[PDB]
């Protein structure tokens, strides 16, 4: 087992709307996941076995981000 992770591999999900939200968080924003049990869970980073910084559900340990407009 390992922490649930963010993927694009599920062809069965909505192409408009979704279970994510953006919230304010210490000097930037965080991404959160509205879990099926009704608690929003922070997305954070976990370094995996091939040294990838994976975006995972990491309750209470958010990845703090900013959003740069393309162009």
């Amino acid at each position: 087992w390992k922490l649930p992770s963010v993927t694009v591999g599920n062809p069965k999900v909505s192409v408009f709307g979704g279970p994510f939200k953006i919230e304010e968080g210490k000097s930037g924003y965080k991404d959160v996941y509205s879990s099926s049990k009704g608690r929003d869970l922070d997305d954070g980073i976990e370094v995996n076995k091939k040294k990838e910084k994976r975006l995972v559900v990491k309750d209470g340990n958010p990845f703090i981000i900013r959003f740069k407009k393309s162009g």
């Binding site: 087992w1 390992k2 649930p4 992770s5 963010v6 993927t7 694009v8 591999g9 599920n10 062809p11 999900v13 909505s14 192409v15 408009f16 709307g17 979704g18 279970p19 994510f20 939200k21 953006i22 919230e23 304010e24 000097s27 930037g28 924003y29 991404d31 996941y33 509205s34 980073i45 995996n48 076995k49 091939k50 040294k51 990838e52 910084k53 994976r54 975006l55 559900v57 990845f63 703090i64 981000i65 900013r66 959003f67 740069k68 407009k69 393309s70 162009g71």
Partner: protein, 96 residues
């Protein structure tokens, strides 16, 4: 309030955005990679290079608002993604 790096509201289903770390020295913007046994790059990761903005995304929120806000449920579409990925390539959560 939710704004982009130039202080403008973020567009709903419009402009593309890069999702970038605030802290330096710890990886670049979010992209896709093969993880473990994957033979198609399906896993959201930050780019190994701090210089990289990663891949562009489009936000998709169901309300008809021109701009997204904090606390609003939305989907995240990765606008440039591997030919092997399902299209449109939408973030979701998976076990493992």
């Amino acid at each position: 309030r939710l704004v982009d790096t130039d202080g403008k509201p973020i567009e709903n289903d419009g402009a593309e955005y890069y999702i970038l770390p605030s802290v330096r020295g710890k990886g670049g913007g979010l992209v896709l990679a093969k993880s473990g046994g994957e033979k198609c790059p399906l896993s959201v990761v930050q780019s190994p290079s701090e210089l990289s903005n990663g891949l562009p995304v489009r936000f998709k929120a169901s309300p008809r608002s021109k701009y997204i806000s904090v606390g609003m449920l939305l989907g995240i579409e990765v606008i440039e993604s591997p030919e092997c990925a399902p299209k449109p390539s939408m973030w979701s959560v998976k076990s493992g």
